[PDB]
Structure formats: structure tokens, C-alpha cells
């Protein structure tokens, strides 16, 4: 059917430490990249991280050559719409990635005001993003396929500014 042995992920999603821990769940989690169950590999990126898992399928991510969790690229980091446009990947890339890719989700009780968890709340009790921007309006195939990619649109537009 669909089996795997090791996750093809990026160094940003792998965690900011040489030693990590993986958890393999064979044939589960319903990977929507190929509509087939894959080995869901959960891990911990570090202290105060998101502790996410694998989302895309194994064979479905081999043709795209992107991360298992971030699903951007393999070496540069641009989206698939920006990678298929064009070196163009040398200038659009950026080393030392931000912690927002490994940051946890927001607290819905903090947005509602009744954050009864307190200082032991694992979620981030900060302000959410602006919904007027297209950066918080992506989808499943919108990030995987190059069609309707808002992150790739601003990457080619801001590349010619000065």
C-alpha cells in the first residue's frame, strides 16, 4: 500500500538541536497529499515549540521535493509556485529560519478573554494575524501546487522593489 521508513523533512522543521526524538505511526493520519495513509512522524522541535507531525504523503512529496511539515522546498525555501517560476532560488532563499514555523497555535480562550489556563498555557496568548492579507488564506493544494499561491506571488513582486 503506502509505507515509509524515514521522513523527508527540512532542517528547519527538524528542530534546532542535533538530538531529537521521532514517533512513527504506520498507516495513519490520512495524508491529504495523495489521499493515502502514511507514516505520521511526530517530533519535538525544541523548548516551547509546536510539536507538529507529518502531513503530506511519502510518495506524493517525492515529486515536489519539499518539507514534510513546512512543504516549501528542499534547499532554497521558496514555495512551489516560486520554485517553478525560474539563480532565482539563490536570491529568494533565506538562511537562519524564523521560529514562527515551529511556533505553537494561539489560545482561543485568550482571544475570547477567558484564558483560564494561565502561565501554564501551552498555546501562544498573543494577537492573531490580519485576515485582510492573502497570506492567511491558503489551502491544501494551493500550497502544494503552484496554482493560486499567495506566498509565491509576493516573493516575485517584492524581488523587484528598489
Amino acid at each position: 500500500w503506502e509505507d515509509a521508513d524515514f521522513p523527508i523533512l527540512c532542517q528547519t522543521c527538524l528542530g534546532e538541536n542535533p538530538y531529537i526524538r521521532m514517533t512513527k505511526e504506520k498507516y495513519g493520519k490520512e495524508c491529504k497529499i495523495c489521499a493515502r495513509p502514511f507514516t505520521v512522524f511526530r517530533w519535538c522541535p525544541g523548548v516551547r515549540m509546536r510539536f507538529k507531525k507529518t502531513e503530506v504523503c511519502q510518495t506524493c512529496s517525492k515529486l515536489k521535493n519539499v518539507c514534510q511539515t513546512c512543504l516549501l522546498d528542499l534547499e532554497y525555501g521558496l514555495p512551489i509556485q516560486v520554485r517553478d517560476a525560474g539563480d532565482m532560488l539563490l536570491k529568494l532563499a533565506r538562511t537562519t529560519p524564523y521560529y514562527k514555523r515551529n511556533r505553537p497555535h494561539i489560545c482561543s480562550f485568550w482571544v475570547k478573554g477567558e484564558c483560564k489556563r494561565g502561565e501554564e498555557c501551552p498555546y501562544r496568548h498573543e494577537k492573531p494575524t490580519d485576515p485582510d492579507d492573502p497570506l492567511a488564506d491558503q489551502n491544501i493544494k494551493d500550497r502544494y501546487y503552484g496554482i493560486n499561491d499567495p506566498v509565491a506571488d509576493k516573493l516575485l513582486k517584492r524581488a523587484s522593489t528598489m
Binding site: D5, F6, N17, P18, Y19, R21
Partner: peptide, 18 residues
Amino acid sequence: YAEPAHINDFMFEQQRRT
């Protein structure tokens, strides 16, 4: 390229976290 090791998981997780 995968390359496993036969080291202990207890001493490796204790040394990296320290």
C-alpha cells in the same frame, strides 16, 4: 542518508538536554 547508531537513548537524551 540514514546512519543508525548503537548508543544508549538514556545517555544521549541526557547529554543533549544538559
